[PDB]
Structure formats: structure tokens, C-alpha cells
Design a protein around this ligand. Structure first.
Ligand SMILES: O=C(O)c1cc2c(s1)-c1ccccc1CC2
Ligand SMILES: *[C@@H]1O[C@H](CO)[C@@H](O)[C@H](O)[C@H]1NC(C)=O
Length: 348
């Protein structure tokens, strides 16, 4: 079990002004630290955030959080479930900011909600240094769905934060799971939502922040571009491993894809997997199976899926070795077959 701590700096809050926090299980014999960002979509105006507050309140508020959480998948402490990092210090950071982890905005007389995801990450890192993170050799910032996009937006800032605090020795890395999306045309048009327009409104609503080099490329008004993995990844300096289903359920949802499939839709889906494969061609550490699914790394059976005969925990161990061209220890694993479940190890 991972145990809840609410932030001692209570100015760093969830959407409704309640304190943010983190769940922690320490490992006294290890110098590896895993900080996992939870996902769960987002909201981009008052009406849509009010609706989220009615029926998704744990993603907006710490008031009803439980005192413990069980670690699963890469957060499990059992070697059988987590061959990769079972002996690490484990941190689960709940997503209570609805801002894809990008916001730096307080609740006030002009703001009904606080959007503080970027500051929550920085504050967790700060309070953990006093609980052992100061002795770390690797800090892996991981996340799924909106949390995976959050890794891409925040990993370089965590690294800069530790260098300026006097800890250049800690190596910061990222693991981004199911957060690599395409700003493509929808299969059938709808009213807002297309990924592009939703992010454009959210950034303004949240006062969202993006990594500095990506901001300097796209410039004022065009920062939404840095929320799209294939645009922000080349600007990053920290090592980042990318996990992405070729046919992500959330990608299909925003594309309005839901009997025998007709030619138009077949071609749309095949072109979608081809485009995803193309954006990964120059990402050296990546794992991308040809499956219709969503998230993987905190699933209890994450050990089951394979690409070219190598599982995800093995690929991540090979990545570790590469950061010390390996024989039989690959790190770039992208399926080439063109339809969902052409890979027999896909989740059922
Ligand atoms: O299921 C979740 O948590 C998320 C789903 C999506 C996210 S996050 C997103 C993050 C950046 C850019 C475009 C998108 C649209 C799809
Ligand atoms: C609390 O967090 C806010 C927002 O990041 C920051 O400005 C302030 O310095 C913090 N206070 C302390 C005592 O750490």
C-alpha cells in the first residue's frame, strides 16, 4: 500500500481549493524513485468544469480521497507483477487539476477553480527531497493518458528544478504512456471535440505552461502545439521512453470512430496506424503495439503484451542498460502490422 500525504504548502491546491497530495511507499534499500502522474481527460470552461465537479469530484478535490492506495503494475512491489522496478520508492500523484498537468493559476475572486498541475508536480518533488529523494540516483517521472502528456510537459522542468536546488547528480527521465496524440481530421465531424480546439481553449482558461524551447518555437498564441507529442518530444533534453497503442481508444474517441467495417472507415483506421508509426520512427526508446486499447503501465497484467517477442518490462530494463546497441535487448519496438489485434498478445 501507498500512504497519503497532503501537501504542507496548502497554497498548492486541487481545483476546488482543497490541498493536493501524493501517495508514498518508501524502499529503504533503493536509490530509484518512481513518480507516477494519474490521467483522466480535462475540462476547459466553467460549464464543463461544473459538470465534472458533479460526477468526477475525486478528479477535482482531495476531500474524499482514501488514506491508502494499492500499487499495481509498475507501482507494484512484487517481482512477479513488476519485473522492472519492484524495489523502487513508489509515488502516485493524484490528478486533481483538470489541466493536463499544465496549469499555474490560483483560485481567486476572478477564478472559480484553481488550475495548478505544473506547481503540484514541483511541490511534490520539493517535499519528497526531505523524505529520501535527496539520496536518489534516478528519478523516473511516469504517467498514463493525460498524465503521459503531463510527463512530456513537465520532465525538463523537474530536471531544471533539481539542478537549481543543488542536486545535479539525480538523473531525471520520463515514461509517457498513452499520451502521444495526433491533431488529425475526424472521421465524421462533430461539434465541440476535436483535440486541437479543446486544448486551445484550455490553455487560456488554465493559464497553462509548456516547455521553454517548444514555447520559443511556436510562440505566442500557438503554445497548444506543445501538447502534441510528436511536436514537443524533439525539443526535450531529458531521456523519455514513449509507450503508445497504435489504435488508442481515446484517439479514436476524439476522431468520432465507434458490424462489418466499410471501406472508408477501414482506410481511415489504417492511415491512422501508419501516421502514428511514422511519428515514432526517430524516437529511439518506444513501445507501440498494434492494439485497440488505452493505458498499460499501472495495469496488473502489463507484463503480458509483447512486440517482436519482447515485453514492456524487458524493453524498459534494456532502456536502463542503454543509459549506463545491445545484443538481444531492444529498446525501439514498434509494430508494423496494420490492423487492431494483428498482434496476438493484445489485451482481450
Ligand atoms: O484520456 C485522457 O486522459 C486524455 C485523452 C486525450 C488527451 S488526454 C489529450 C492530450 C493532449 C492533446 C490531445 C488530447 C486528446 C485526447
Ligand atoms: C507555496 O507554493 C507557492 C506556489 O508554488 C509558492 O509561491 C510558495 O513559495 C510556496 N511556499 C512555501 C513556504 O514553500
Amino acid at each position: 500500500d501507498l500512504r497519503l500525504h497532503l501537501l504542507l504548502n496548502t497554497s498548492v491546491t486541487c481545483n476546488d481549493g482543497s490541498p493536493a497530495g501524493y501517495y508514498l511507499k518508501e524502499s529503504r534499500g533503493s536509490r530509484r524513485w518512481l513518480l507516477f502522474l494519474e490521467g483522466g481527460w480535462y475540462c476547459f470552461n466553467r460549464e464543463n468544469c461544473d459538470s465534472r465537479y458533479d460526477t468526477m469530484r475525486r478528479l477535482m478535490s482531495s476531500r474524499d480521497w482514501p488514506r491508502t492506495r494499492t500499487g499495481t503494475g509498475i507501482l507494484s512491489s512484487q517481482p512477479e507483477e513488476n519485473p522492472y522496478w519492484w524495489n523502487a520508492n513508489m509515488v502516485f500523484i493524484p490528478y486533481c487539476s483538470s489541466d493536463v498537468w499544465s496549469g499555474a493559476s490560483s483560485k481567486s475572486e476572478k477564478n472559480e477553480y484553481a488550475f495548478m498541475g505544473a506547481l503540484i508536480i514541483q511541490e511534490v518533488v520539493r517535499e519528497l527531497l526531505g523524505r529520501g529523494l535527496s539520496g536518489a540516483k534516478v528519478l523516473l517521472l511516469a504517467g498514463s493518458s493525460a498524465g503521459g502528456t503531463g510527463v512530456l510537459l513537465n520532465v525538463d522542468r523537474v530536471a531544471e528544478q533539481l539542478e537549481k536546488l543543488g542536486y545535479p547528480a539525480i538523473q531525471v527521465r520520463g515514461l509517457a504512456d498513452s499520451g502521444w496524440f495526433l491533431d488529425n481530421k475526424q472521421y465524421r465531424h462533430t461539434d465541440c471535440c476535436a483535440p486541437t480546439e479543446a486544448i486551445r481553449r484550455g490553455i487560456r482558461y488554465w493559464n497553462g505552461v509548456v516547455p521553454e524551447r517548444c514555447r520559443r518555437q511556436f510562440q505566442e498564441g500557438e503554445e497548444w502545439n506543445c501538447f502534441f507529442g510528436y511536436k514537443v518530444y524533439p525539443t526535450l533534453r531529458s531521456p523519455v521512453f514513449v509507450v503508445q497503442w497504435l489504435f488508442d481508444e481515446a484517439q479514436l474517441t476524439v476522431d468520432n470512430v465507434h458490424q462489418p467495417v466499410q471501406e472508408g472507415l477501414r482506410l481511415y483506421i489504417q492511415n491512422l496506424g501508419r501516421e502514428l508509426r511514422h511519428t515514432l520512427k526517430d524516437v529511439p526508446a518506444s513501445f507501440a503495439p498494434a492494439c485497440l486499447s488505452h493505458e498499460i503501465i499501472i495495469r496488473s497484467h502489463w507484463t503480458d503484451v509483447q512486440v517482436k517477442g519482447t515485453s514492456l518490462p524487458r524493453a524498459l530494463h534494456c532502456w536502463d542498460r542503454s543509459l549506463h546497441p545491445l545484443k538481444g535487448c531492444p529498446v525501439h519496438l514498434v509494430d508494423s502490422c496494420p490492423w487492431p489485434h494483428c498482434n496476438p498478445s493484445c489485451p482481450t
